[PDB]
Write a protein that binds this ligand. Structure first.
Ligand SMILES: *CCC(=O)Nc1ccc(CN2C(=O)N(c3cc(OC)cc(OC)c3)Cc3cnc(Nc4ccc(N5CCN(C)CC5)cc4)nc32)cc1
Length: 261
């Protein structure tokens, strides 16, 4: 009941779009705090079933994870989170900001995402849908991991997860490696020109995406570590975070900006 707020304290202002979570609004809470607001169509979830799914958002707290702010847990149910001003990392990379981002910006964003996932890792959770569409961007290039597990992606999914349902933090590490290609191509679809069926067996036959143009080989090698066949050999998010945080001193101290990266 601590998270419950009055219905009149939310003002729904702008629809954000119909993605994997239906309609989500930008709005204001208590007239003072900009927030993201989501309501559920009455019927699709009982009030008891929702509060059992609201447990995840009420216990997990990290500066790189989209923060739950409040809840209206009786139908029609409302969920309130912090608001991320720039939308999804996917839209961010494809839009007008894309042309200005270079490797220093893209690596820092990746380090932030790795930091959120390192928190998920430390908590022994799994975020089975890590990809640029599920990262939200705010001011000052702040990136936060969103979790649409309540909403209930072959090209982003580790082979053992897509084929055998072996979803672990290690398959999340595989997805992060795909996410690094979205960052370095400024949001292009991975495995360009390959259909899902084509991606499945090609990857099982050992294929991996090549080094994106102007992406340093050292960053591509990091992607390849994320895409090792045996999940146990993939690096931890703790490792990924440190490698990305330290990247331009320890790993590319001679980096020079190019035309796109
Ligand atoms: C699966 C792929 C997908 O559709 N991903 C996706 C869906 C929805 C949003 C919008 N959200 C959002 O859903 N948030 C959220 C997550 C959550 O976890 C259960 C619960 C919620 O309850 C409220 C909410 C949070 C959130 C925070 N900020 C934003 N900001 C945002 C700003 C701008 C835009 N734009 C899209 C339209 N045009 C093109 C540009 C501006 C979108 C989102 N959104 C969400 C995100 C990802």
């Amino acid at each position: 009941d601590a998270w419950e707020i009055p219905r009149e304290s939310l003002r729904l202002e702008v629809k954000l779009g119909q993605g994997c979570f239906g309609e989500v609004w930008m709005g204001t809470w208590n007239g003072t705090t900009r927030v993201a607001i989501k309501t559920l169509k009455p019927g699709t979830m009982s009030p008891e079933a929702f509060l059992q799914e609201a447990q995840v958002m009420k216990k997990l707290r990290h500066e790189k994870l989209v923060q739950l702010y409040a809840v209206v847990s009786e139908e029609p149910i409302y969920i309130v989170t912090e608001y991320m001003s720039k939308g999804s990392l996917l839209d961010f990379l494809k839009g007008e900001m894309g042309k200005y981002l270079r490797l220093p910006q893209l690596v820092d964003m990746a380090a932030q995402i790795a930091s959120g996932m390192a928190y998920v890792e430390r908590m022994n959770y799994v975020h089975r849908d890590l990809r640029a569409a599920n990262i939200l961007v705010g001011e000052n290039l702040v990136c936060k991991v969103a979790d649409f597990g309540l909403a209930r992606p072959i090209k982003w999914t580790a082979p053992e997860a897509a084929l055998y349902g072996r979803f672990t933090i290690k398959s999340d590490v595989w997805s992060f490696g795909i996410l690094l290609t979205e960052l370095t191509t400024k949001g292009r679809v991975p495995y360009p020109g390959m259909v899902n069926r084509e991606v499945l067996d090609q990857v099982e036959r050992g294929y991996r995406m090549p080094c994106p143009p102007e992406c340093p080989e050292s960053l591509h090698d990091l992607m390849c570590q994320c895409w090792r066949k045996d999940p146990e050999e993939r690096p931890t998010f703790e490792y990924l975070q440190a490698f990305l945080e330290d990247y331009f001193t320890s790993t590319e101290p001679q980096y020079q900006p190019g035309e796109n990266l």
